[PDB]
Amino acid sequence: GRGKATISNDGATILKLLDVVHPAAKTLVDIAKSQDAEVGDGTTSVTLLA
Amino acid sequence: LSLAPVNIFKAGADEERAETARLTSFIGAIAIGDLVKSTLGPKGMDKILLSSGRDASLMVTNDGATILKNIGVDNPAAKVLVDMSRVQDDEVGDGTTSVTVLAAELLREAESLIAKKIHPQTIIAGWREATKAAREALLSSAVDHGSDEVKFRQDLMNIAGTTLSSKLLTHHKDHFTKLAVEAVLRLKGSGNLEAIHIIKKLGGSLADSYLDEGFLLDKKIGVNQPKRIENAKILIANTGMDTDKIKIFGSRVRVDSTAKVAEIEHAEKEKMKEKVERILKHGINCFINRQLIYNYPEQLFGAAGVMAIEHADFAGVERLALVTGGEIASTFDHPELVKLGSCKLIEEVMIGEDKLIHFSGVALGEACTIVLRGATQQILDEAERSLHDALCVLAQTVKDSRTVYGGGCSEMLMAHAVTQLANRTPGKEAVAMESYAKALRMLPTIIADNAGYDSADLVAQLRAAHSEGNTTAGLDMREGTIGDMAILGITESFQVKRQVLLSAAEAAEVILRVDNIIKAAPRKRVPD
């Protein structure tokens, strides 16, 4: 909302930058943070698989 | 169809491309030089400036430096000519009107050259060879003096009577020329123009002004202290007589009885008595301080017959050390390493409705005061402003004593040197050089246009007389004919004319190179 641009190719930071408010869709954003906390890679491969 | 389909700038920001930026920079600069042109020459008129938010301060002026500093312009290219005009006033103090008109006539001749499909870099490169050939022909025409006293004094009188011409002081030119040339010779070669204090006050005519032989102070003496003392010995000091010396530490009194407080209070009162007695060991009768003097030491000076002057700022203490000849003293421990002032009579004078302390008979006299009298408040302000232009230009002639014949002779001189150069260089620069020589010849045109004379005939006579040998011919504004400049006595300063060409050629170069004006979003003002 201020004007700062965040340019990135990784799922984890893309889903953190969207103001998702849908209760069902918020499960897919929570499993991405789990993957980047345990292994750190494969974040966007668990979003298409889910 | 619009300025590119995508949006790059923000909301409120504007851009101007080549064809429209040259339109703004060229109409902005000409507008500045048209308002100011009316105040040029011996017969120039006068303007009125009213403030709309500054409590309606009405000021009336003639010089082209205070007018530009007051007019609020929002044109980007008109702000360059207002800045360069301030630097001229702060450098030599004279020639602000001529530097803006010349730099505004160069731009007017550079718009018809772009319409001839000439690249701007061609004009600039052609003008550089025109300024170089113009400053060489002015240096060679300067008359260096200063080896004779009877000749140098006559050169300073001619300069002073030439600057005061367009100004309101031109009515009494025979009287204000002697006050302006004698006040500069009092400085004895020191360029400190601050030493001349101009005191202005209402009442009386403009012809009642004079230059005092001694000095004048707008201060007061203590109570029941002698008004006059003949053959005074002044001591100039800067020391704290306020209450007492606070003796800066973190100290305090912690006695346990109220009689012990009374003993300490009596200790302060005997601290100031000792300080006063150390002053009197110098053998003085006129103590002058730059801070306040309280009621205890005021009576100590009045019991021994000493005049005490209190609350005189730095402007009145530094000046008094150059007039009488003393020194600013403190710590009062060695009376033999200090030097006292001297006078012959000190009295109280009545100028209008106020009292001033008069210093008649002085040792050195390196600073002075000028008393200006007038009918209105705007005449006093304009007399002070005009007189400051006479003192500033006479402080430059003493350091660099070489003069150049003025009154239109110098402008036609440099214009002929460019013409002979423009008839030699092939290419397009011959066209650009003629524009430079065309802009120098309109300065004498404006002077004759304000007087209602046939300008188109006088310039032709001057140009024909400057290409055959007569290098001193110029305008004669008292009759309307052509007269010699070495006989009538129209003389200028070499540094003033040199700073006009160099400043008016740089500002026309910076402005001409611009081809894109980019404006940011203005800062908004909160209405409530």
């Binding site: - | 006068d46 009213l50 009336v60 009515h171 009374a262 005449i379």
Partner: protein, 479 residues
């Protein structure tokens, strides 16, 4: 005039009306500063100088339509001004300062135009008396009006105004009961009488019950010590200067001072110490060891007066060593009458000041204005060119004042100036407008005169302003 804050002032001075107005034209804001200058040096004629300046600038409208450059008018006006001085100087008559009949006649002429024209058989003599008591008539070059103090007091009427040859104080005494002292010894003090305070931050520490009683006891013996030094000198009236950082007089010092029959007067300002020292001749005292019986100024009577209910006042009269100061008390019924009565007296002091600087007397009542309008008419016939039109314009503009004096009195202005000018070129040159008889007669038989400095200073300043207006050609608005 009614201010926008709710202040109403009934005035007649030309320098006061133009100050209270709020004009916005720049060409008229310069007329206010013109009348200010005349009030500073001359002190009278502030209304005449605006009429002259407002009539000369008008005569310039027709000359511009005839094709005359404004520069020529500026130089041609100086020609008619330098000649006008030479016509006023030989008209005047020298006067001495030992002739009360001349000063009395000149102090009423600038008194009969105001609201106190009826009360001039009393204000004129007390105005001449107030100036001869300040300057030395043997060697006088200027008079200071700062040596005359005007006191405004409400109640009563104008004819109750008097001249006090002493000191008048507007504040009552602090001591109660003692209001009448004869053969007093006045003394000025600049130090305070309270608990001891030093410039450094001090404090008293008590750590025992026996020291509590000593603080009160030793304090009481300190104030008593200073009071016993004052009574040793034989003082009756006390004058304390105002102090703000510390108390100047405690309740204990006042209790001791009443028991010794001494009048105490507090709250004296720091700006009027000089006027007090110049009146009773009192050495100021700023330290207790310097309070000697020579630092005192004697007097005859020093008692407070009580009005009809408008307040109290202090009068000290019969000073053993009088100075060169005098004071005036102004009495009126309304706040508006007092202000106009005060400005009228200040006008009668500036006329006496003008006589000592330039001892020359010139007949008034429109006599000089018509004389410059007659010599300049024949003067312009000798000249040739475009300057012969500007001098004729100068002469015609000088008939406005002789026209105004006859128009306000209900006479025919055309017949009065025609009769006045005709009689001015066939004989005597002291003929003016007689407002009492109703025609034109010799103006010296009406005993009306005016100083020469007023008529000249109202002309030199007028021509200079017009010469500056003609220089202006453009008006631009700034920030």
């Amino acid at each position: 005039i009614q201010d926008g804050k709710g202040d109403v002032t009934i005035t007649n001075d030309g320098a006061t009306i133009l100050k209270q107005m709020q004009v916005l034209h720049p060409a008229a804001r310069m007329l206010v500063e013109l009348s200010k200058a005349q009030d500073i040096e001359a002190g009278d004629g502030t209304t005449s100088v605006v009429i002259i300046a407002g009539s000369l600038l008008d005569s310039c409208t027709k000359l511009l339509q005839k094709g005359i450059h404004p520069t020529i008018i500026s130089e041609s006006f100086q020609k008619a001004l330098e000649k006008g001085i030479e016509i006023l100087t030989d008209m005047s008559r020298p006067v001495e300062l030992s002739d009360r009949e001349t000063l009395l006649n000149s102090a009423t002429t600038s008194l009969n135009s105001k609201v106190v024209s009826q009360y001039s058989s009393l204000l004129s003599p007390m105005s001449v008396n107030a100036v001869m008591k300040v300057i030395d008539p043997a060697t006088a070059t200027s008079v200071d009006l700062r040596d005359i103090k005007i006191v405004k007091k409400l109640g009563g009427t104008i004819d109750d105004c008097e001249l006090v040859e002493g000191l008048v104080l507007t504040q009552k005494v602090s001591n109660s009961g003692i209001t009448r002292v004869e053969k007093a010894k006045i003394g000025l003090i600049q130090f305070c009488l309270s608990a001891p305070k030093t410039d450094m931050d001090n404090q008293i520490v008590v750590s025992d019950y026996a020291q509590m009683d000593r603080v009160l006891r030793e304090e009481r013996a300190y104030i008593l010590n200073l009071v016993k030094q004052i009574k040793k000198t034989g003082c009756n009236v006390l004058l304390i200067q105002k102090s703000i950082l510390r108390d100047a007089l405690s309740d204990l010092a006042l209790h001791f001072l009443n028991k010794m029959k001494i009048m105490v007067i507090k709250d004296i300002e720091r700006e009027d110490i000089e006027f007090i020292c110049k009146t009773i001749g009192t050495k100021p005292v700023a330290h207790i060891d310097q309070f000697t019986a020579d630092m005192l100024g004697s007097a005859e009577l020093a008692e407070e007066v009580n009005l009809n209910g408008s307040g109290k006042l202090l009068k000290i009269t019969g000073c053993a060593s009088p100075g060169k100061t005098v004071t005036i008390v102004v009495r009126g019924s309304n706040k508006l009458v007092i202000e106009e009565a005060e400005r009228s007296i200040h006008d009668a002091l500036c006329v006496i000041r003008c006589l000592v600087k330039k001892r020359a007397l010139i007949a008034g009542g429109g006599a000089p204005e018509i004389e410059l309008a007659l010599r300049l008419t024949e003067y312009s016939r000798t000249l040739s060119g475009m300057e012969s039109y500007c001098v004729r314009a100068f002469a015609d503009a000088m008939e406005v004042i002789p026209s105004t004096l006859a128009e306000n009195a209900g006479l025919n202005p055309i017949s009065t100036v025609t009769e006045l000018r005709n009689r001015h070129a066939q004989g005597e040159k002291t003929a003016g407008i007689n407002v009492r008889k109703g025609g034109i007669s010799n103006i010296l038989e009406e005993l009306v005169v005016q100083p020469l400095l007023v008529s000249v200073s109202a002309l030199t300043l007028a021509t200079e302003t017009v010469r500056s207006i003609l220089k202006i050609d453009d008006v631009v608005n700034t920030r």
